[model samples]
Target chain A: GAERTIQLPKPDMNRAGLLMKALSERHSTREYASKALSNTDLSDLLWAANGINRSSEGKRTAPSAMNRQDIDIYVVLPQGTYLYDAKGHKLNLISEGDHRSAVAGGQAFVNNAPVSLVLVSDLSKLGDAKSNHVQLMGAMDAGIVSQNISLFCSAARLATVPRASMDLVRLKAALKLKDTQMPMMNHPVGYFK
Target chain B: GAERTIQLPKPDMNRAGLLMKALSERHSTREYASKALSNTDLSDLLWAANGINRSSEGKRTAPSAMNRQDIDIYVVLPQGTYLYDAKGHKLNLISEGDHRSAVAGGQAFVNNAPVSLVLVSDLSKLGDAKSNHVQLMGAMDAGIVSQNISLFCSAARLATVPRASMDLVRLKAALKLKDTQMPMMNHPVGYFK
Candidate 1:
């Protein structure tokens, strides 16, 4: 019923492989191995997905249209659903137990995968310029974060695919998202089977 | 004056440097030198935006929801404005004359950049799912393309910043865009100061 928070390790930034090879190898795939991501891998994955790169200025690795940092990330695992607190570098649980299938549109491969990420844009976080343009920017921010994850997966020799076919209604409720939060895309990451 | 068409060379994807370096150095720069990009670099830049990666199936480097490739790229140079035709890997003239200021929302640094990119989602390309969710997906698709451009800029040692602050009416009029083509974000790219 209630969530229990989990403290994660600091991400090791030194492990990122060659940039050229990552770009060339970044591609989406539906196949995934049942192998689960270790705490270290998960930590690195979240950090790459728009972490606080410039801690001095509170800016992220990815650029928002106006630095609105509206995008929020959630990692869905067998244990529970946890929000990625980029500022604190910790997994804050909002829901208890496994809900991986709902997060991934009940896809078998995705359900079998140990880790799937949900990226959402919280409209309330947007300032005065709220309109179509702002929303577009928020969506683009999601894309930047997604691309970061894709590239990181490539560098780590992992397989992943970002999907738009999420059960939004189910996820919205299960993840305990606020009314203003909209899930943009679900990325299932793992080693290929 | 009428627009003059210019043919662009195929993108050379061989020299992407390295993946690790790109990730390490992929940061936005608003300050730019007024140096112009060569036609070769422009080709690669546009290709990175959303080029046809799979020539056989007309698939793009960036993934779109439901294969609805809605992100249309407009290249704004000092001489004029051009639309990136991903199918043929060419740049087609849209409007002639300098309109870089309008593309960057009149930001001095961006205005000084040699080239700025305009990315829009043509809603007409969507299938049966013509809802708000589709548009959100379209917005994220534009983001993916933007990130591709960002990574490419890192690889090539160029400077770039994606902006949502735009003069929509002016840019739409200058680019000769239709009602269905929604402007998502603008990216000013060049050498960092």
Candidate 2:
């Protein structure tokens, strides 16, 4: 069944201190509760990933080469998958069914977690560097965003693991990613049991 | 002629606030004064880029995946280029003679700047992810190191630019870099003109 459409809340600066605190205190917790993460939690997660940091310059929470900002975050939840737009602080639905378990590569905690964030970096816009270097740049950009998510999740007392063991070719096909864009890391977030 | 070694003062904890302040205020400054950067300045710049953040964890100023800390920063100065050892926070001479201008695609400021930092990511240790997603990961990791350098330079009111136009093959050959470690980005740092 499809979930109801809900607008994610704008990240409140008032919570910035608490967020930073959460981040500083965070560590990897493999165990997770079965409870689903709320949309607000999802919003904050995506915002930390690649949300706009300097709106004026269009600088994001993460840095990109030549400010290309080519990374795309795909959110996979138990219900389905969606693309996160940090500017709008919203999720655009991709598929209408739960597939979090499969996306997590059969990890129990990942399968149980309500949310999984897959960070994709587009290598095409990284026009200046060599082909191999471009890929590195994209991955680096995606890593910064991932770090932010980790910090944010830590601050919120959530459980998260940055997984690198996923089936890349399958993910690329499932997400219908182009040659320029490829999935770099998969971070599954949920409550601790 | 070989230049004499100049000792730069190590940054103390009290300097942390100043350093972070500089980072927060830093921006990419393409303009630069014509003065050559001292060996000390080059040393501090590298330390700030990915130097050890915490001695206990061997945590660095820049974060790496699985604490692999696989990115290696090389400084290409007017006189020569050197590789930075985070563990020792020392510069290992890589090549002799001025190669900054060439590496920067004839950017005049690069010649004027005291030092240029070339970020290279080593992908071999990244295991399965190395083949699957190491390129993007390297970029992400290198970008973080670059941001720290950029921010630190900015905090110091220095001038800097992260450049992508460079002779990669020449750099690879000059550094004698392994197949897995690839040059990702170059940042020139110096006093603003």
Candidate 3:
């Protein structure tokens, strides 16, 4: 079956909340309600995660080392797995199938969330992947993107937690990622149970 | 002269703007005004960077891998250097002297800012410093802290930029950091020039 692109609606900036209040309320939650995430929530979440903030400069909300923009966000949903196109504000279908289990790994709680955002760093964009410094830079850039997700979830009153563990071998195959692209973190997002 | 602790004012949450709005405005700035950063801005900036959010768990605004809380923020001011005591919400004096030039490295713009926040990851908290995985984790944690600063400056209408280059040897000696402590990023903050 051929994969199709998912055109996401424009992000609802009106749903935004105060930054300080979000910071105060931010916390990790493993349990999630069975309810699937709404389209608006998902749209705003993706935009907040790493969308192009400055259109003129093609800059993202999250700053990358030397503007390499190595981090790529993969959205894993029940219907299919897709890659977030920050510039187009849409999803380019990567794989068409439920791959939540691959993102869940050994963590049973992850399956409860409706959406899992997989953060991968394309280290080839960053010079030598073999160098410890280059690898560290990629990891750090992933962290920057992950924090934006965390803060957005906090502000929107959504439940999310950043996890480093995932089925790497399976995910690599599922996402059709190259050897240089390393999956560093995943965020399982849902509503309170 | 003996260094003295400076008690910070409570974070002015009312001054906070919308997270989405901040994300839109977020961009790195190198030029800064000659005017000094007010006490309120400094207090709020430090709090937003990596302060303890939930006092009960001693959790910070930024999430660390496995609750390690490995990243420590050092404030470099004109008068002296202070370590941000997130738990106590105060500054613990580390050195009694101006050290902006040490943080500036070859970037002369850094010294133009009134304050610099240096992010150091205590890798010993995670595990062996020799492990490449440990180093990557520490760097990622530092990035998490750095993003918080970046976003807060955006929300508060302050000017700042995250820089990886710095006089590491001088900074380590000035802050009296141990071998296991790795400085990953620094933010030179000020008002717009």
Candidate 4:
């Protein structure tokens, strides 16, 4: 049961806030309530992060360089870790564990949040992983996805902060990531305290 | 006449479209109408790109690593090139000439658009420009700002595509940029054709 893919509810796009209002109120929120996020909120959050916008072309809400779509969103919940399937709008089980500690690293506040969305880039998809230019491209792609999550949280009145510091080694091990896949950024999201 | 700074109209935030609608409709549009962006649209576009979000903290709509605020937006118009002044909400004239061809590079469609917004990173603001890690940070910052332009265009019914190919040498000289400042991405924006 724990390994089964989680089917997220359809995102209620109509309920989202105006772009200007979201930007006007956007800020880095550190404190979050212990209240867990509903499935609906989680669904909307994942979709907004890097979901497919054009089904035919398999394009995403976040534009990638050369449409590589290298950035992957991994959702870490209390029960397990799952990779967001943008096309299916579901979560594929990545690993069964409470790996929030790995994501939090030195920041205890990160663990206080209900969910952590990790942004990783499969560098192999872009080009040579060792190339500095390729790494830069991955960073940019991660940044694009990070902004989408930030803006969606702002509009939905959720608390989230984009973070660069994380336990990369432990996370890679916990998520069973390959050498080419590197975690670029993460967001600890929940209701505002 | 073109040497003076231009004070843009205050952005009409209330008229901006909802975030979900913007994301749902978001797509990279290359073809554009020759219709020039109105003052209101231009003002709003710059504001949405990377304007000052929190006046007290000098924070921006696009979050930067360590609050570096490293990215600077350069607005290229038919008459001149101007650097976007986030705090003043205005455009400071950089050079008085038609430099669209430089931004267009090999693509002739770039000149067709009335406005091309170039995203540049003052790497010195972050750290050592030669450092690969620091340069990656700059790239991510540029990516964040690029998405802001993309989403704003999607919401406001404008056309734009995030591009990496541009004549960096020409743009640097045209804008009088320092060696530490590098152009990372750009957006050629206009009304849809």
Candidate 5:
């Protein structure tokens, strides 16, 4: 499909909620409801995931190695798969139609979740790919982003689980990603059941 | 080193303190004070790193891949280096003496900090050595733990930084870690200066 569309997020930083309470309540949730997220919810979710928090220096909510900022968050939903444009705060459509199954692999629960935030690292952004800390660095970067998502979910009373069990081949094919991109994890998030 | 002993974490699970405010304030810092952390402060820090949050389930504050629980948090202080035993809520002594500089590689501030939480992943805990996701998964686990530390530090009004730019060869020899153990990152943390 050659279709292209972009949805700008209506992020209200005011709705981020309290951090300590969220940390205390944070836990892995394997259950989720098949409910569509409001634009505000999606906006807040992505903002927590890896949105730009500092506008002056242009830093993200999560820290990256050497400020590489390499991880790319792709929002996979029932409608389509889209890349999170952090700088622009928009969901850039990557593929049309549902490919949520590819994002979760064998996990049946993921198919019903409202959205799966797929994290991939573009190695090119970090100088060279030959470094020993390449994938490790990217995983750490993506891990922080997912943790932010988890904390945000905790505050909002949402269900979220980050997993690496997805079928890489199927996801690669579905997203039509290049070899340079490494899919680290997929966070299946939705309303807690 | 042989005279070392274990200390149970006097963690107050009750004082976790706000999520949204913490998220907004969470940022890495390179400067720190030489003042040592209080026993209570150390306990809270370790718990935030990856203590057992759920007693019956033995689930930690951070999620692991398939509950592998492969990542180990090492507390490095002027007196000695200790391994965090999350299951027992105690600090099991690793070796005696200050090796903060070695633990941090070339980062000058790490030695002056009261404590440095070193994250190491034991690949032996996970089956198979040469798997594609082995190191990546470990880094992600370590990263999540560090992120939790950052968020907690924000709430506690402390200073912290996660560093991956360390000398691995020097760190391995200093820690006397296992063959399968990979040093991912070291977090230099203390009260905000």
Candidate 6:
């Protein structure tokens, strides 16, 4: 059967309370259940991380330098790695194959989890600058985007761990990234119970 | 009178709504009121920029890498530039003369505004990898910190602009900063009307 487009429902305002409460109770939970996150959970989590909050200005849940919105979220699941299209709110296929274990670097939790999000920053969007500060700005952009994801995961009662430790070179080639885009962080998301 | 310590009242939940609204409405305001911002306004703006949101985890309004919180906010006012101490929630004296105009590259708005927040990132925490990516990560960390200030300023209905144009070497010498600390962005904060 052909894969059908899945549109995750927007979380209600009522979820705001739960989300806030989850933030208060939030911590880096590495342990996880074999169960995969539901589509709704995935949707709310992604939306929280970098979903468009204000449609009018094209503002995001997270902040970007000069509203450049340069960071991209790539999801590496058991099936394959996909790029998150914020505008369409759908995952576009990047490659076909279970690359989670390889990307996670043999981390048991990541291997067992249902989904992992790789946050990448495209430096070319930052313009040509000789100063090292430009790169810092790009990473900073990725961090804000990642924090939104962590906070949202907390609110959705999902288990997530933001990992900076990764085989960057290997993951880069696996994703077949352009010369300008650099992978910043790896966050594995799943259900705790 | 010697500087006396006075605690600013925490904004109630109702005030949170006002702050968030201000943030949502906030755009980079390059034009600021010619008059100087009052000491109270200066204090509140700094607090909003990087003050502690919750005291429990010592979490700040901004998120730092690994909760390491390496970024520092320095205030360049009509009086002088000073370091903001989040733990004490007080502005520590750094110099005894006005340097806002100098720090801001003589921008009329920066020169005229009562307060300018210099966002600095300390790279000593990052160690000696010197990898292209690590340098980028440090700047990214500082950028996230700056975004928090920008959003908070917007949320507070204040005029603020995050500018990267500056005399880095001169400013570092003037601040007498350690080699590890690098000034990334300068945010000029004041009233619009």
Q: DockQ numbers for every candidate?
A: 0.47, 0.20, 0.76, 0.80, 0.50, 0.25
Worst 10 residues of 1 chain B by lDDT: B15-24
Clash count in backbone of candidate 1 = 7
Q: Write the per-residue lDDT of candidate 5 for residues B97-192, one digit (tens) a residue.
A: 887888768767678788888999888787654564688888898888889898889878889988886677877776789888988888998988
Using DockQ as the measure, which candidate wins?
4
Candidate 3 CAPRI classification by DockQ: medium
Q: Categorize the docking of model 5.
A: medium
lDDT of 1 at A50: 79
Off by over 4 Å in 1: A1-5, A128-134, B1-5, B128-131
Evaluated on CA atoms against the true complex, candidate 6 attains a DockQ of: 0.25
**Tens digits of per-residue lDDT for model 6, B58-112:** 8765555567777788877666667888777677677766777657774555676
Interface RMSD of each: 2.4, 5.9, 1.2, 1.1, 2.2, 5.1
Ten consecutive residues with minimal summed lDDT in candidate 1 chain A?
A: A127-136
Candidate 6: TM-score? 0.78
TM-scores of the candidates are: 0.90, 0.73, 0.97, 0.98, 0.92, 0.78
Candidate ordering by TM-score (highest first): 4, 3, 5, 1, 6, 2
Candidate 1 residue-wise lDDT at A51: 80
True-contact fraction per candidate equals 0.49, 0.22, 0.72, 0.79, 0.48, 0.21
TM-score of the second chain in each model? 0.93, 0.85, 0.96, 0.97, 0.94, 0.83
Model 4: residue A79 alpha-carbon error in angstroms: 1.1
**Higher-ranked by TM-score: 4 or 5:** 4
Q: What would the per-residue lDDT of candidate 2 be over residues B54-89, giving only the tens digit for each residue? A: 677777655677778878987776666677776765
lDDT of 1 by residue, A1-193 (tens): 5457777899776674765456556678888888888888888888878787667788876778668788899889888899999888898887887878787675777787788899988876774335764565667788988988887888788889878667888898879987778787789988878
DockQ of prediction 5: 0.50
Comparing 3 and 5 on lDDT, the stronger one: 3
Per-residue CA lDDT of model 5 for A1-193, tens digit only, reads 6236566666777674556556667798887887877777887888777878777888877889888889898888787888888887778888888888998788888888888989898877875665646777888888888888888898898999988888899899877788888888889989987
